[PDB]
Amino acid sequence: AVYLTFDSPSYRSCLMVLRICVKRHGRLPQIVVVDNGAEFHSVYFETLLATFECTKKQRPPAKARFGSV
């Protein structure tokens, strides 16, 4: 999924990217790996991942190699 918007990242960006991922393919990834940004440590994203049985993984702060892909 690829999404583009002028606004700073927030739960809206995650919402749009996950909706695009579902639309293009049909299923969310089983283990979603996200960074320690405040937009991921929120209440909307966590319940959204919980609703669709998505294991959420959090890379340690200031360790970008965990998202090397």
């Binding site: 405040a38 440590h41 929120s42 209440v43 966590e46 319940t47 919980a50 609703t51 669709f52 049985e53």
Partner: peptide
């Protein structure tokens, strides 16, 4: 602490 969601066990599965 700051902007930190309280520890909770959210329900899982589409209601």
């Amino acid at each position: 602490k700051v902007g930190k969601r309280k520890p909770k066990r959210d329900p899982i599965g589409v209601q």
